[PDB]
Amino acid sequence: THLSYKPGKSDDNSKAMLGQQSMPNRPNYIAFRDNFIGLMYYNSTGNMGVL
Amino acid sequence: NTYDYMNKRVVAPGLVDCYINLGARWSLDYMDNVNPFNHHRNAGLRYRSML
Amino acid sequence: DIRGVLDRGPTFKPYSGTAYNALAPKGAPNSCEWDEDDTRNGKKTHVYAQAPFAGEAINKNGLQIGTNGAATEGNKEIYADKTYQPEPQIGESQWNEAESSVAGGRVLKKTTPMKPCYGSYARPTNSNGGQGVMVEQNGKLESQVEMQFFSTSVNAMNEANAIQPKLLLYSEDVNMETPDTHLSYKPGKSDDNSKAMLGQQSMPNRPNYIAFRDNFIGLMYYNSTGNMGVLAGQASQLNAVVDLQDRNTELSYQLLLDSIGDRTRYFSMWNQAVDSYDPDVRIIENHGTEDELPNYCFPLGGIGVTDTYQAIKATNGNGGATTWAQDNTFAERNEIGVGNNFAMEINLNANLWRNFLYSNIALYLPDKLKYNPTNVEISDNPNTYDYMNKRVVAPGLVDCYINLGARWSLDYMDNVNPFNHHRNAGLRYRSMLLGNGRYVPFHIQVPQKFFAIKNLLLLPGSYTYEWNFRKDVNMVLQSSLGNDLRVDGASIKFDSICLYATFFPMAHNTASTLEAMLRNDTNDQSFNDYLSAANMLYPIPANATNVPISIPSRNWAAFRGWAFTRLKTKETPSLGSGYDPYYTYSGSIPYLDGTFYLNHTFKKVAITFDSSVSWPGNDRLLTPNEFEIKRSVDGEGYNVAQCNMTKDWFLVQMLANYNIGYQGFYIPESYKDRMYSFFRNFQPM
Amino acid sequence: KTAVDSITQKKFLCDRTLWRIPFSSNFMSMGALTDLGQNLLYANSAHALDMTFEVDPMDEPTLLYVLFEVFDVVRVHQPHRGVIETVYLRTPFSA
Amino acid sequence: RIIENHGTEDELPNYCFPLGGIGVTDTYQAIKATNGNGGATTWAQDNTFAERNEIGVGNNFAMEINLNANLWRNFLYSNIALYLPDKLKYNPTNVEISDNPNTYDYMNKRVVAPGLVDCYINLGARWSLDYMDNVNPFNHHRNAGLRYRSML
Amino acid sequence: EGYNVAQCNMTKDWFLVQMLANYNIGYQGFYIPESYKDRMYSFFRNFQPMSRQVVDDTKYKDYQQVGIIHQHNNSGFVGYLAPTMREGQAYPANVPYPLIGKTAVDSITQKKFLCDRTLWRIPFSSNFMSMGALTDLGQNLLYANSAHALD
Amino acid sequence: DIRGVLDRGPTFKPYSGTAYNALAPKGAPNSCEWDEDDTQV
Numbered sequence A: 001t002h003l004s005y006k007p008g009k010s011d012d013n014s015k016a017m018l019g020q021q022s023m024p025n026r027p028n029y030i031a032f033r034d035n036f037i038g039l040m041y042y043n044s045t046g047n048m049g050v051l
Numbered sequence B: 001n002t003y004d005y006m007n008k009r010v011v012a013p014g015l016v017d018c019y020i021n022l023g024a025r026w027s028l029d030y031m032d033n034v035n036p037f038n039h040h041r042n043a044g045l046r047y048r049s050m051l
Numbered sequence C: 001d002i003r004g005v006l007d008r009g010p011t012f013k014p015y016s017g018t019a020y021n022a023l024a025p026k027g028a029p030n031s032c033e034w035d036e037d038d039t040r041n042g043k044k045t046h047v048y049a050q051a052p053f054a055g056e057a058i059n060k061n062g063l064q065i066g067t068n069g070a071a072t073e074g075n076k077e078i079y080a081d082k083t084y085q086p087e088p089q090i091g092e093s094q095w096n097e098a099e100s101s102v103a104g105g106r107v108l109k110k111t112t113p114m115k116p117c118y119g120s121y122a123r124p125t126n127s128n129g130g131q132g133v134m135v136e137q138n139g140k141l142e143s144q145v146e147m148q149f150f151s152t153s154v155n156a157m158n159e160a161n162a163i164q165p166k167l168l169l170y171s172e173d174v175n176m177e178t179p180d181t182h183l184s185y186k187p188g189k190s191d192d193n194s195k196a197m198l199g200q201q202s203m204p205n206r207p208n209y210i211a212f213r214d215n216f217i218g219l220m221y222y223n224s225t226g227n228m229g230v231l232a233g234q235a236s237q238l239n240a241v242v243d244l245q246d247r248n249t250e251l252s253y254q255l256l257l258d259s260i261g262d263r264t265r266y267f268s269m270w271n272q273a274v275d276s277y278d279p280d281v282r283i284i285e286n287h288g289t290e291d292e293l294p295n296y297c298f299p300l301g302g303i304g305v306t307d308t309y310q311a312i313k314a315t316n317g318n319g320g321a322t323t324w325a326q327d328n329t330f331a332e333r334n335e336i337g338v339g340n341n342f343a344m345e346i347n348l349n350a351n352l353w354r355n356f357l358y359s360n361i362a363l364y365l366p367d368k369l370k371y372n373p374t375n376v377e378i379s380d381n382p383n384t385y386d387y388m389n390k391r392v393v394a395p396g397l398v399d400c401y402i403n404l405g406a407r408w409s410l411d412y413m414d415n416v417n418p419f420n421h422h423r424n425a426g427l428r429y430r431s432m433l434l435g436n437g438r439y440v441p442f443h444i445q446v447p448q449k450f451f452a453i454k455n456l457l458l459l460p461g462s463y464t465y466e467w468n469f470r471k472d473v474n475m476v477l478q479s480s481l482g483n484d485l486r487v488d489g490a491s492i493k494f495d496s497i498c499l500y501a502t503f504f505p506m507a508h509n510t511a512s513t514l515e516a517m518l519r520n521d522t523n524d525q526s527f528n529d530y531l532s533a534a535n536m537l538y539p540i541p542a543n544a545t546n547v548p549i550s551i552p553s554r555n556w557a558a559f560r561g562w563a564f565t566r567l568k569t570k571e572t573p574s575l576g577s578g579y580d581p582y583y584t585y586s587g588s589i590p591y592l593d594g595t596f597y598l599n600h601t602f603k604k605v606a607i608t609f610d611s612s613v614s615w616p617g618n619d620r621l622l623t624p625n626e627f628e629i630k631r632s633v634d635g636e637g638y639n640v641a642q643c644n645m646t647k648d649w650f651l652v653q654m655l656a657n658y659n660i661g662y663q664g665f666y667i668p669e670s671y672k673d674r675m676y677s678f679f680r681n682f683q684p685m
Numbered sequence D: 001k002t003a004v005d006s007i008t009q010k011k012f013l014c015d016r017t018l019w020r021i022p023f024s025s026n027f028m029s030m031g032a033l034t035d036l037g038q039n040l041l042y043a044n045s046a047h048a049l050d051m052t053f054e055v056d057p058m059d060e061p062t063l064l065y066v067l068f069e070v071f072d073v074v075r076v077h078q079p080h081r082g083v084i085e086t087v088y089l090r091t092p093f094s095a
Numbered sequence E: 001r002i003i004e005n006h007g008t009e010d011e012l013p014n015y016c017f018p019l020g021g022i023g024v025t026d027t028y029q030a031i032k033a034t035n036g037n038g039g040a041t042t043w044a045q046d047n048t049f050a051e052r053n054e055i056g057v058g059n060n061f062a063m064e065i066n067l068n069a070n071l072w073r074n075f076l077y078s079n080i081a082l083y084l085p086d087k088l089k090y091n092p093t094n095v096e097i098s099d100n101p102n103t104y105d106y107m108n109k110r111v112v113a114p115g116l117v118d119c120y121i122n123l124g125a126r127w128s129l130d131y132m133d134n135v136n137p138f139n140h141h142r143n144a145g146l147r148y149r150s151m152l
Numbered sequence F: 001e002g003y004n005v006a007q008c009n010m011t012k013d014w015f016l017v018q019m020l021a022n023y024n025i026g027y028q029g030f031y032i033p034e035s036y037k038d039r040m041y042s043f044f045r046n047f048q049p050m051s052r053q054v055v056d057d058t059k060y061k062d063y064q065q066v067g068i069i070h071q072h073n074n075s076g077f078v079g080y081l082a083p084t085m086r087e088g089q090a091y092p093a094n095v096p097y098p099l100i101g102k103t104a105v106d107s108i109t110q111k112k113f114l115c116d117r118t119l120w121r122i123p124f125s126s127n128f129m130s131m132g133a134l135t136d137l138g139q140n141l142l143y144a145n146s147a148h149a150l151d
Numbered sequence G: 001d002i003r004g005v006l007d008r009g010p011t012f013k014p015y016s017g018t019a020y021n022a023l024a025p026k027g028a029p030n031s032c033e034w035d036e037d038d039t040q041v
């Protein structure tokens, strides 16, 4: 979470700070692409494969 | 580009609410040019990332 | 190809629920003030409101909110503008936010009516959102908002001019409208703003879509001897299209389009979207809800009550008995609770199920189970929109307990035409195609549906091609509820109509060869309509269970068979005639797009040639001389398929549809069994 | 444990169809022009038809929708340039 | 069969209100403004306004509640929690229970702690619980065919 | 608008070209192409028209443009320009404009479509059909015995 | 057929909302005690 409303500036404990609140961070997944696209070079004169 | 900038820029709820373009099956003009696949609802990306 | 302008009238609401302040409670009124008899007699005025905004100080100018530090008069003050300040919605920040000194707010005037916050609108009147009405003085528009200072009531106890101010309310005037909601509990007949009127409630009006029918049915005159079309050779001065009042074209095109393709997908060009209905609205799979856990709200700040307390450091005893004392390290007055924090409570799921079960079934019950309202004027015309909007239907009829745990449909709801609804997905799609407003300029393409020239390959020449179109407003359109449309005044005007056609860039000589080859006598064109049936309609007076029909002597060469069904007279225009004035229903004709529901309302049928020789012939059927469709419970040995029907009628239907039945039944293949079939649309309960 | 005594009801729904009875002698469909349609009995003589219906009562006026099934065919001929002629046949219930 | 937990979408608190809309209340009284001649400002009491009016100040009384989350828990519970293996349960307190470990009474009157499965069990992972695999998943009221046959 | 079609804004010519180049339907009257010829990356599986109406700004005599900051609906029950604790007081709402009922406003209509997830095609045929893996015009002599520049 | 070790950084979060006291009202703080300066000293 990250504080979605911070009334004060200094983080010191104070009477007002009993009013701060929160909000969950947005989700983002991360994985391997479809069909591993890009995992294998192609189409580039630099690193041509060999059979 | 990093995460926190995308996580802490806040946007007013009022821009979209249950009184938007009522009755009309329709897409928001700001959203006809934003890649609709970099979007967390995506089933394939979700499945791959869980796997 | 047609271009025109459509107006859908005043009675078109395309959404369930309302739009304005929908979160506010359905009995909460806005800030206002009304008049009470003095207690001549100087009638007094009472105020119900609150002041959310917090400011600095109050003087005879108003409430000060700014401080221009570099002002010419030192630190001159900045008072809120009376036209839009203070904003209605600006409030506090934190859940505690201890009270300020002064405060301000907005409040209506006694002149305008009072309506609950749920469903309240008033158009703005300045660039910054002001709602105060304007008045022309000296030829220029000016405002009328006027302060209303206020102050403690403790006034009532000691002290004097020490009376200082402590809450300025700004007060004005609006042009309040309630476009899509109506009153559901009005306590008094009179309208003068009482004390009790602060508790009136409002609810929204049933959604009601209006759009073009499927495949643009009704837009072109077919089967009308008065206004038959024409496609003929120009010089011929002789016709080439003939028609009778029985060739029922539109249903035939419906069925043909069913046969050679799928239907559960939509094509925008011809409005191809058949009208479904949710399988759970018609038939209820009610088995309660999952609520083993209780739900519970909580105090915005977590703990609700409290109880000051005092630190007591343990200045322990001396020798024996343990004494105590006080400490000065801590504070002196502390907030502390005891026990479980105060909490409210709600059952979640059952509320959602109950809301849905009321809203999607109960409002459509047959009219004879509803009761007029109190203290609201309701139209005396039992077809218009208002009547259907304002009757009251007891929620106790349908709720969580009805037919619990059983799969069933209510006997009241069997004969209600279930394609007139608002979850009929095809209707929603079509109504959204045009747009959600009420003034619509449109641009459409209509097919040609008469079979005898539907596919004919024309050959070179000059032809006269001409046709007629309807201007009626309940034929070419269709509602969602079934209300008339001439009453409510929705109009439609055709401006330009142009004709398009496509060719093939065939090679010259090849086309010449084909033309010469096809002009010969012996290779002409043959065409056959899909339905290939007659049409007979016979009246059925109310509360009768017997219909005889006789056909006089005639020959029957090359017959095929009988099809039949039943229809409601209120939902069927007269044939042939170009305009049926006695027609006052704009729902969905079954006779013109194939939507039948009365099929279960039959008992049996019997046939005879020359009044003495029955025709199942020769004792084939289990009953002697009659097709026993359905038996009542007395049929101790012939009910089949765990339901009402008899075996033999089941056998006859299964044969005639799928050629199954002489070797044990089973589920016929997919592609052999289409949407309008038998087995796709069979439900025992 | 305390269930009251009860009786049982049953009924079916047949939304969105037609009821069919074809003119075979075995209730099958073995080709469009059915066998009984050309038998000598029903093609070279006259006959009179009587149908009797028993239904379930209602409250508003209604219509019985009967569909006799026959053939409807059209032959279209066009000898010269820009002249088209046709002929129709609708067997019994003819024009 | 497979618990596929993504959390729930809740970025807005959902609040409930007072049946009337305005919170507490405090009597108040109207005043006017006879000029403060040569001096500050007077402050009298006008007679046109009846001298007991209702008014709240600041915001209004309100209570909070988390709709989506609450629904999800109900769910997981009612649909996965109860069917756990017998050995993960304890007898209830001060109520009779038949000793025959098969009949309905025993099958019902036991209690299973909703702490074992929560809104955070294996959160974010497509997975299935160890105790559940070797327990039949066709004996379950979420069944379709069994429901259809029971209702028929 | 004399040429647009399918209740959208796409000229008839482009619709004809697309339908022919994809499924060779278009010389016998249009209809929904069959399933197996219409896969995921097809055209007709990725074509959606849409339209709406909004409030005109030159005929509604009492039009008053309103910024975001001064817009209030559901006031006193929601936040102010953020997802935080509720603020404010009850009041009639200022502006979602009305479009239905006895009190409509002068409105205009807008139309557009969405066709993501496919390529726009043009076949190099004489009459835009798929008559063979090698088109006919590619064999036409004038294109196979000289050179030409393209623009 | 490859094998390796993958690290998705610190910005990896596969769920909407959170898992820590999800029901608790957003505003409320937990038990605490802070300091103030008494000006009457």
Ligand SMILES: [Ca+2]
Residues within 6 Å of the ligand: E025, E026, E027
């Ligand atoms: Ca009080």
Ligand SMILES: [Ca+2]
Residues within 6 Å of the ligand: C153, C154, E026, E027, E028
């Ligand atoms: Ca008081």
